[PDB]
Design an enzyme around this catalytic site. Sequence first.
Site, PDB file in Angstrom:
ATOM      1  CD  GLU A  39      53.034  61.101  28.292  1.00 50.85           C
ATOM      2  OE1 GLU A  39      53.992  60.338  28.174  1.00 50.85           O
ATOM      3  OE2 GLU A  39      53.035  61.982  29.150  1.00 50.85           O
TER       4      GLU A  39
ATOM      5  CB  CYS B 237      50.584  64.907  24.138  1.00 51.61           C
ATOM      6  SG  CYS B 237      50.999  63.122  24.240  1.00 51.61           S
TER       7      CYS B 237
ATOM      8  CB  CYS C  39      49.598  62.535  19.655  1.00 58.08           C
ATOM      9  SG  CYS C  39      48.946  63.533  20.949  1.00 58.08           S
TER      10      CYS C  39
ATOM     11  CG  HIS D 200      47.746  68.791  20.893  1.00 54.58           C
ATOM     12  ND1 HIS D 200      46.432  68.937  21.297  1.00 54.58           N
ATOM     13  CD2 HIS D 200      48.153  67.589  21.369  1.00 54.58           C
ATOM     14  CE1 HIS D 200      46.060  67.865  21.974  1.00 54.58           C
ATOM     15  NE2 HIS D 200      47.084  67.030  22.025  1.00 54.58           N
TER      16      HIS D 200
ATOM     17  NE  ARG E  44      47.778  57.950  21.828  1.00 56.91           N
ATOM     18  CZ  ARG E  44      48.811  58.036  20.993  1.00 56.91           C
ATOM     19  NH1 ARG E  44      48.829  58.978  20.045  1.00 56.91           N
ATOM     20  NH2 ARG E  44      49.824  57.168  21.076  1.00 56.91           N
TER      21      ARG E  44
ATOM     22  CB  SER F  97      43.063  60.572  25.553  1.00 55.94           C
ATOM     23  OG  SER F  97      43.908  59.747  24.696  1.00 55.94           O
TER      24      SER F  97
ATOM     25  CB  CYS G 282      47.465  60.337  25.276  1.00 53.40           C
ATOM     26  SG  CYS G 282      48.891  61.454  25.410  1.00 53.40           S
TER      27      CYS G 282
ATOM     28  CB  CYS H 225      46.333  63.887  24.833  1.00 52.55           C
ATOM     29  SG  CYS H 225      47.296  64.207  23.367  1.00 52.55           S
TER      30      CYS H 225
HETATM   31  N1  FCO Z   1      46.498  61.102  19.043  1.00 50.29           N
HETATM   32  C1  FCO Z   1      46.656  61.756  19.978  1.00 50.29           C
HETATM   33 FE1  FCO Z   1      46.901  62.861  21.503  1.00 50.29          FE
HETATM   34  C2  FCO Z   1      45.414  62.061  22.380  1.00 50.29           C
HETATM   35  N2  FCO Z   1      44.514  61.581  22.899  1.00 50.29           N
HETATM   36  C3  FCO Z   1      45.939  64.036  20.679  1.00 50.29           C
HETATM   37  O1  FCO Z   1      45.320  64.826  20.152  1.00 50.29           O
HETATM   38 NI    NI Z   2      49.229  62.363  23.374  1.00 55.14          NI
END
Ligand code: FCO
Ligand code: NI
Lengths: 544, 262
Positions: free
Chosen positions: A20, A67, A70, A74, A471, A494, A538, A541
């Site tokens: 992503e 994002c 995922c 968040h 992640r 990430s 990601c 993210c």
């Molecule tokens: N898993 C996920 Fe997205 C990322 N990097 C977040 O937090």
């Molecule tokens: Ni993400």
Amino acid sequence: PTPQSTFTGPIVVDPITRIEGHLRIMVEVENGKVKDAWSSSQLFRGLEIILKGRDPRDAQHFTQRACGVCTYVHALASSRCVDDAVKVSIPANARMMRNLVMASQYLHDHLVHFYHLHALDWVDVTAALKADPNKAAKLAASIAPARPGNSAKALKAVQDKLKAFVESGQLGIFTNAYFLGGHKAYYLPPEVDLIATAHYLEALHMQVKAASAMAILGGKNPHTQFTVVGGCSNYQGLTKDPLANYLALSKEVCQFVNECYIPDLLAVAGFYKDWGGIGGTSNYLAFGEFATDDSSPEKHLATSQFPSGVITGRDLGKVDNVDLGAIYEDVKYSWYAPGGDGKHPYDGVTDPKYTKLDDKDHYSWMKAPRYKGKAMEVGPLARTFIAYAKGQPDFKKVVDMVLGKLSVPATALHSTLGRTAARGIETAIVCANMEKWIKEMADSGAKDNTLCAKWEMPEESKGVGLADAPRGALSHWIRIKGKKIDNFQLVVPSTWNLGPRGAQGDKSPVEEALIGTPIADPKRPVEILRTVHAFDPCIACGVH
Amino acid sequence: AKHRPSVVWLHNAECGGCTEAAIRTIKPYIDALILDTISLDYQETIMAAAGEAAEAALHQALEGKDGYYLVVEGGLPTIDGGQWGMVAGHPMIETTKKAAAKAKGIICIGTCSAYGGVQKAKPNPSQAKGVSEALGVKTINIPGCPPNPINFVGAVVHVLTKGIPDLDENGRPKLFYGELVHDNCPRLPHFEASEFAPSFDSEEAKKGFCLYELGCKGPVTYNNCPKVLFNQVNWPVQAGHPCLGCSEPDFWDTMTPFYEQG
Ligand code: FCO
Ligand code: NI
Ligand code: SF4
Ligand code: SF4
Ligand code: F3S
Ligand SMILES: [Mg+2]
Ligand SMILES: [Mg+2]
């Protein structure tokens, strides 16, 4: 032996697809091996800037849009964050519901990552056309558990669909695939390509079921809408008929993880055993997930059933406690203004300043998060090493299992192959726990259906929400002033993994992992993709 | 070998939730769609090729003799000549403009591409715009954050098999966006009786009272959520949470504070 050209010179891969978000990878190559690397995030949105001055209750709704892969995580982190800022302890039922939704997200996210994002780096879909479906069936019958989807007839129908598609001349998402025409770095027998392609297609259907299960508790997927300051809003999530359907769906998903995901992953691992020697890093961080006590960030750290910790220098004998005061972010090599280095996230600054493409002095929209001056890898591998090191019984069992199946030592796990295997290992463990966690919440929900606690908005406060998302180590950091958001900072898994160099010029985990990558074919550098994808990157993210 | 209509799908300033939402389609499933219905010729999230090979795949699709339809996910960041958002070394605004020029049709999947979305919210540091505004071209908008796959796939299939569906003033097909969330909400009788939850912990909330006093924007939001549900099982108000108004243009600024009506 691992295929490797003699190529000396630069390689840029932009876009990195099957992730992503928007990532550019630059490498310098010498005699067919990566000698230097840059991880260059190519989009800024600036959610932290956008949140300033808004209602702390609104935070989760904005930040969830960091994002949608995922999704949820968040919103969860923001809710834990504001919960901590207002000093509210969520009811038992809310802890369970929030953790079950996280568990459902792990299953969805990991399944889709292995098949739809990562597998095309290891599986030559077109070579599957060369398989004898009968020979493929016998192969699958000999290694994996018995199933109708692995029969000659099922595998032939898959091969028949693929052949009609390929012969149409419209290859769609396979157009210009690095495996077209064969590729020295792709090792799988054609029968294995067929089996994995069959499951790739299956997994497209099964990920729908994994998202339905999640939505029972989450309201919808993507972008759940069931969390509030003080707990959750979803009273129907505690009643019998929905949880029975939640169980039934998670069982289907877990059967597919055990019948297809884990056996495919182990087959791939067996054939690409050399990738146990490539792509290793040394430091690991996790905030833990699936806590029995989420009353405070301290308690989350201490009681996470997937434990928290810090490993440094691959030393599995010394798991340190997470010091949340020791986290900071640098911007020396990022596209932000001068004077933003060494900021703890409570004092975070997000002042965008672009320069130009491939400026080695400023080359990413990600900040560089550092822990006491060290870069940290986060994610399934970090969790697996931390859990193993601490003797978590499920992680010790499944790891030693995987190691014995593969006949490799535990040190081979510090690698791209390890990173990939760790993702499966923890999926299997989430699966084994689902029924107990669901039962816990069903029993608790029937006795007393309290789901949200009362709370008061303080004039001035600060708080932090921690989660280990699919992640890795995720943290949201708020300063409240005048009952509004004074500062709101995300530090995302990430960002830890794929950010640029920190202020001391020190490579981030993905940049270090890329050093020593063999390149069999510089025109089609799939080896770069295998290592990058194994981090499950990601950028949406990472940069937010 | 019947030719399948070419679809090019671009990712600009997005979070990927729209791509995720699309793959939750079950009528048909996404495999059937890309194997029998369309030819999905560029899609960064799932395509095999990467780098220059992916860029060449994009250019092959854009040069295709049969033309193509364009799906855009995400807004376009326009500050600094569009350099804050780039793919293959090119501003997203430049590549989207190029791809829009010859498209048979443009479908904006999600509130971001339709109207600018989350990154456009104040103070808009990347000076992000919706596609129609940035390109000056007409779009079929499938908003929501993300839209239901039922709405996106239905629009794709409608456009390929009939033509442009009837759109409302904000460019949304009336087949899906013609009715207020609130007019189809099962808690409407509570709204009518002024039976409101004053808080999420209240006995009123437990009894499933109306969420209007808790910020519910269903009365001003056009979407089909309570009728079609998400993922075949649920929707936000059924899960006890107010509607955020996420299929409305600029909802990040017009529907906030989300927990208030002020
Ligand atoms: N898993 C996920 Fe997205 C990322 N990097 C977040 O937090
Ligand atoms: Ni993400
Ligand atoms: S509309 Fe919402 S879900 Fe779609 S890309 Fe924009 S932020 Fe993500
Ligand atoms: S909960 Fe929202 S959509 Fe439903 S009746 Fe109340 S105000 Fe209307
Ligand atoms: S928040 Fe969006 S998904 Fe539907 S219920 Fe409201 S329009
Ligand atoms: Mg080609
Ligand atoms: Mg940040």
